[PDB]
Design a protein around this ligand. Sequence first.
Ligand SMILES: CCCCCCCCCCCCCCCCC[C@@H](O)O[C@H](CO[C@H](O)CCCCCCCCCCCCCCC)COP(=O)(O)OCC[N+](C)(C)C
Ligand SMILES: CCCCCCCC/C=C\CCCCCCCC(=O)O[C@H](COC(=O)CCCCCCC/C=C/CCCCCCCC)COP(=O)(O)OCCN
Ligand SMILES: CCCCCCCCCCCC(=O)SCCNC(=O)CCNC(=O)[C@H](O)C(C)(C)COP(=O)(O)O
Lengths: 104, 178, 128, 111, 220, 124, 175, 88, 459, 67, 62
Amino acid sequence: QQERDPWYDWDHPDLRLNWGEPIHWDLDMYIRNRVDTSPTPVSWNTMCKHLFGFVAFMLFMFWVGEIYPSYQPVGPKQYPYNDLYLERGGDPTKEPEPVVHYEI
Amino acid sequence: AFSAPAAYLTHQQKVLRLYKRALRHLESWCVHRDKYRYFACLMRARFDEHKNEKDMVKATQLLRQAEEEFWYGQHPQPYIFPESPGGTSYERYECYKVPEWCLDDWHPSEKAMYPDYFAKREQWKRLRRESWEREVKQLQEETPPGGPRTEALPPARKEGDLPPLWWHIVTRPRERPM
Amino acid sequence: SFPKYKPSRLATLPATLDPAEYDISPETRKAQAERLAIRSRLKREYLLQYNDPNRLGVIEDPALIRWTYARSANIYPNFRPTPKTSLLGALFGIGPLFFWYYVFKTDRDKKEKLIQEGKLDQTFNISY
Amino acid sequence: MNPFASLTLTTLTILTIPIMMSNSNIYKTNLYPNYVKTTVSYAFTLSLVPLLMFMHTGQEMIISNWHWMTLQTVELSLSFKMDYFSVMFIPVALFVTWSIMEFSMWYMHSD
Amino acid sequence: TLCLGAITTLFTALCAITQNDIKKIVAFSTSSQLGLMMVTIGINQPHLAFLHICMHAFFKAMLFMCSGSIIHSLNDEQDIRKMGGLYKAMPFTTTALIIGSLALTGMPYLTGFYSKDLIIEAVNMSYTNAWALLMTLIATSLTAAYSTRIIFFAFLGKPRFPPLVLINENNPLLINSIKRLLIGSIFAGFIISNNIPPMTVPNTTMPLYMKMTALIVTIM
Amino acid sequence: GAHLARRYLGDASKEPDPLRMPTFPPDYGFPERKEREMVATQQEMNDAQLMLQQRDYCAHYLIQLLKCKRDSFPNFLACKHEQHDWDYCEHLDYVKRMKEFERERRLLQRKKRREQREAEMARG
Amino acid sequence: PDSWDKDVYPEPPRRTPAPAPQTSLPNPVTYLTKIFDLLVDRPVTLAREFIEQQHAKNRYYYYHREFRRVPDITECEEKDILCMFEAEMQWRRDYKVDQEIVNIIQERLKACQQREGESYRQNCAKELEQFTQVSKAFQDRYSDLGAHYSARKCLAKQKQRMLAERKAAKEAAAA
Amino acid sequence: SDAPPLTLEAIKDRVLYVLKLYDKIDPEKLSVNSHFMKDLGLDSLDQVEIIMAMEDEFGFEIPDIDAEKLMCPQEIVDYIADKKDVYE
Amino acid sequence: MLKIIIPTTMLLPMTWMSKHNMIWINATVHSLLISLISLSLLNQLGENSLNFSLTFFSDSLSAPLLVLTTWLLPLMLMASQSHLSKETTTRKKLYITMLILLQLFLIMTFTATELILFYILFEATLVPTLIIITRWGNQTERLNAGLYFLFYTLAGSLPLLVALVYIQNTTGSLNFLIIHYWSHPLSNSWSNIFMWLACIMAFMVKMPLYGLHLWLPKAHVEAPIAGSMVLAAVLLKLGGYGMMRITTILNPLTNYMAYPFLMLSMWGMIMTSSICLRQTDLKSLIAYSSVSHMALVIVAIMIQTPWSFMGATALMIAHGLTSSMLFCLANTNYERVHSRTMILARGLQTLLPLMATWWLVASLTNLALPPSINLIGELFIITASFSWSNITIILMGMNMMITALYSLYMLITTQRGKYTHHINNIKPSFTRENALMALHILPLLLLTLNPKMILGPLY
Amino acid sequence: VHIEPRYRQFPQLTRSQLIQAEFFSATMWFWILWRFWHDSDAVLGHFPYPDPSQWTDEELGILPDDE
Amino acid sequence: RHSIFAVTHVLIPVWIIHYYLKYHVTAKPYTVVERKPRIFPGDTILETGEVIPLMKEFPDQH
Ligand SMILES: CCCCCCCCCCCCCCCCC[C@@H](O)O[C@H](CO[C@H](O)CCCCCCCCCCCCCCC)COP(=O)(O)OCC[N+](C)(C)C
Ligand SMILES: CCCCCCCC/C=C\CCCCCCCC(=O)O[C@H](COC(=O)CCCCCCC/C=C/CCCCCCCC)COP(=O)(O)OCCN
Ligand SMILES: CCCCCCCCCCCC(=O)SCCNC(=O)CCNC(=O)[C@H](O)C(C)(C)COP(=O)(O)O
């Protein structure tokens, strides 16, 4: 219905239909709140190629950047009390392995 | 919108419509007024180059390849006037348009306010009721036996006649009804 | 010259790119006049009731009634058991049911034999 | 009792009063938009106080005021979390809504 | 979350720079900033992300209100190709939209700056997906470009609107509301940033080129 | 960045990996190493409720800054020395981490240089 | 207050610091607090005083209902419908009381997580362990019974578990 | 508030304004009743440029089928008036 | 239970001895009074059901259903008296008599202590419903609809009769209390499989289960407005109530006999929701929506958990109110324009604003907006299904989307856009119609405040 | 404040909108300059970045490749 | 009539809410829970009059 003439004097202007005219079997699918079949500037099968290519390129590059992350030339951050052993869930009766850091 | 359409467009009408579309899309591409004015004159010239062609076939092929060029080079987002069928205000005020027959269902207390408006409305209703039969008869007179051929309607021709089928054209709600 | 536009189902062919409207014959013009006449006769029939002063109610449209009847009540009288109809019916009717049965039965068998093993992490799962 | 909870709840409570007055005479007049705008500005200036309390002492609270329903081992209650996020986002949203309602009184005048 | 945010900010920014409707441009700007909020959630900086939500509210609401004053003055027209020289015709709207554009682009000592410059700093200095970081930087440049498009097209040049000039921004409601959000967009960043406890271990040590990365990208 | 270029394009064997580091003992090249100390007790960081990532070796300056911000509340611009101190401690922590990275990188290069070249002096 | 038992709903001693001003500037929070006090907390307190004056005049009480202990489903013979009925009603009341016990423990857990702030992962371990013990017990007793549960199905579940445990202990004794 | 209701008189002054700003039309000999092709010696493309100027004037687009027939300034005035609901 | 029942019976001669112009007034007043008295069954002991006598008992499952029945009767009277104005006095009294007999049969069915009495009343409800549909139905198609409604129902319910008498021969009783206390497992044998099927299929066809649902669009569309109201609000819930009662003697067989019914109900949920998207008739759309909702209830009952039973009870009640409201809303427009086609009348919000508000609220409860009880029931069922298997979320999630889609589609098609130009007989809304909508809607909203009342026995 | 249209001319301006616009633009620029005078560190960085190649192996603890 | 808005829209609602919270909601356990207040070295408790000792004589890298 979006393809019809909007400047014509339809009996039902928003539906773009004339009284007594044959109605398409799929009118309720084409009411123009819905599926639009209007001609586009760029061809179908060209929009599809460009969209799929963009998305595939982005996914491939994100996976690549996952293999090759960015970081700074730094050492792992150090925390005082056996890496805060009692702080991160504790269990204060089992003698954690000494995590001890040295100055540099 | 107001004129009855014809069975087809002539070559001349198609050419004029393509001229207008090409100019509008060129204005969309050429934002500034001077640059658009320049390229629009170049367009008019390129259009006038084939103005006086007598071979209908070659004129048709010129029109066809011009349409192909327009389609390849059209603006994907042309300027639209706000109340035009693609505009951002196209049907904005359709929720405010109420048909006039709703006024007859008003409560008498509602019509107590506005007495003069409703007197004048009763006058209009009398006019329509007293014109209807003449309208029908005139339309039956002026119409070929095999039904009408176009959507064109005749005017009034006698002394106190009204143009047939006028009520819903004259009593449109408004275009800014509230 | 310029790259061509090829239409598809969900993006149709523009009218100005249609070779049919640039190859006109007298029979085409007579067809267009016939169509216009049909449109005109229908328009007048509608406008004569629309503008009628004495008419109160909803104008009835036989095209709308034909549409709803064809979409609901005329469908079964015009049905034939065909290879296409039968195969499509079987597929779209019982295929998904068995697909979902396989999926859910597999998942629940995994979960149950995992519970029998004492291996599921069911702590805190009082509500069910 | 500590003011922090009363003010955080009153901030949201007074916003419902112009909705309660929706069926009232004020709605049919041309004074309703100004009334809603004024209500929102008062809500903003009121929500400014719990923000000060948090910015001073870091006060946070949760309020489970009404018990709605309980399903065997699960209890559902009307509860409000009044941490840093709530007390910082409420005045910002009220400020922006106040500005946009004052703007609407002009932009939407002929609606 | 980081990857989803990175693609979203770059894509929306890319769509924005060719739009002709002013509301569409600002909406794509909003989508891009939401993508930035998602990338800063992805690098485990929730508090930083929240700060941006508060900062962005001010100047993005102001940008929309400025666009609205323009639209109403120009008889409900939204296409920037029919908006000419308003830098002089609408002086207060111009001032406000310029200040909002400078806050959106992270101009120093502005509300946008605390929220966005810290986010770019933290995305630069974390163990993060490299593609996400690159897309974030390209989007940071795109933001400057779309903002430039609106100002150049809507406020500079010669008039391109119809000749019956109805331009009038002399209404105290409009002026007061926009001025309120303007004062917000200028000072809220500083005040809020200095009045909250620090939930983030600040990045104090970074190479100078990395430090100027947001600025370098924006100027480009 | 240059370290990423060296690791991903050059021989990654010669670059430290940020996840698995250090691989060498902390006492390998040093004769004696003083182990890093703490100024804030566990109970202090628990009573302050700092955050579990703000409980690093700089947390005493953070407690300074937080108490001083709460003390001079209306004047939110009076806690400048405390902020600078916490920032400076954090910067020194960061340069310590950078020294760890650099120290690790040299050892790997040095170890490869000595081990495979003693293989050199053993192949002939 | 004293209305609820502080042994079932405990809380730590509530240490709060003293204000130590560091500036000459006036604290707007304390002034706002005085304003709030003398505009809100005093009229409300007076209204409550009057309400409780009117309450004291007419004082009446209600009593918690006490239920005897009847024989459970284990000591009911197979088709005795009256013993079965009373045992099933008792089992249902006990199920309700157990739900409320788990509710109390969950309330403790939530209150601790909120109260302890940034230190909840270490400071609420006892609450978490208490919940774990209660949840394990409640799960053994009632999980997987399904709708249409009953004392007989709970007994069958217990007996199945007891058989499995006995057989496991027996084959552990042979080890 | 917005723009004052249009008056046929302002309309017609505006159409005449655009028409004398057109180089192919003699100002000292153009009238509200002058036919475009017949009296002023224009062709269809001139008339198309004229409708496009009129839409640029009044900020609303005119359909091609309707325009084909706006062959004098008075017809343009009548079209704009009946479209925008002006009686005086 | 006698106190509720006798007055309902009294309603019969009260309407037969009333003056010709006072039948509606009298019936409405005393129906409302009966509804008020019934309201007192909501007080429930906790551990067990209230057993008034050997013959009748009330449950927390039962109490909500009875209150909904008694409340629905006066609403049906308000909805009927408009299109029945031209009718003779005797035929109006006969119509009201049909409605009263239906209410009487329904109250007894829900409270009968044993299955044979439940079966007899559950089947007796067929006669007044059939008479209403076929005698007062507007279209020619009503006769076919009546046959479909009768035969689909009896083909399921007669095997149930055989199964019930067999069960009483082997067990000695059909009393529900004895049935519950003396329950024993069902072995896995062909005999037990067919006993399970005969115990389940009647309630399945009442729900209706997808694929056995074809009677419902016919019967619900061809019925008069009160017939449709009672068919959607209450008569569908007989299947759910009966299944919830009967599944106590079916364990542990249900563990695997439920698989095909779960598959049918989930996929057919998706199917009927999608069907609602392409529907040209407005009553047809509401009927299929009912089907989609009852599929959710079937899943909840088949998985047999306390949360699923609670969700099923809440969803049954909420659906009963919402579906009746939607049918009444459609009927007002039908009364205006005398056609059921959805695109005939458009832009009705411009002509009838308060009715548009009623439309919006009904559409919002149909898509289960929080915190309405529609969403409470749906969410509880979805959680139980998630526990049953985590993959159900995909189907459940898809259904939620399609429901929002067709609900707002109906709202937008009927209320928004521009009005059809030709139809000029759309008069203002009557006080009767507005009051009918409010009396549907206010109770639903009120129920949100006290969710436990509609939750059921498991709560 | 009554402003009427002008038809192809620059619109009528009041003194108030000009003074307010210029005041607020100047306020923004003054604020930026004040901040950069007082908090130039937040833009230019405050602590020096160390160069790892400036680091001896005595402080960094690696042996001279013979052990 | 000058200050009639601030008394019926701010003052009356805060009277009802503060009354409701002070005597009804806080009459039950764990309904209003406030995260415990931060303590710093050198702070003085209000209840016990405790003093928490200061924090270990910084290396003083001035
Ligand atoms: C459109 C909507 C209609 C309503 C839907 C009705 C659904 C009814 C379906 C009934 C569900 C299952 C029925 C019985 C459960 C298992 C069926 C059988 O196939 O399982 C195997 C049975 O083995 C073989 O399959 C034998 C059955 C095969 C013969 C039946 C014909 C099935 C063809 C499908 C016809 C469609 C029926 C519905 C008509 C509409 C299991 O192996 P086994 O452990 O050894 O047998 C268990 C029983 N024991 C313990 C007594 C021994
Ligand atoms: C509107 C459509 C609804 C259609 C519903 C149809 C299915 C109904 C369920 C099955 C119906 C018949 C079940 C019989 C009633 C139960 C009685 C019973 O349990 O007794 C069994 C007897 O079981 C049978 O004899 C049943 C055999 C089946 C005979 C009739 C076949 C009809 C078709 C069967 C398949 C259809 C059922 C499912 C279809 C659902 C609808 C699509 C065991 O007793 P004993 O004989 O003593 O055995 C042990 C001692 N030796
Ligand atoms: C950026 C947007 C894309 C733009 C691309 C568009 C490309 C356009 C290129 C040019 C198109 C042509 O030459 S199209 C070639 C068509 N040739 C003819 O029409 C010759 C015969 N002339 C007539 O029929 C009449 O004189 C008529 C000319 C109609 C006037 O009539 P009036 O005087 O009675 O109005």
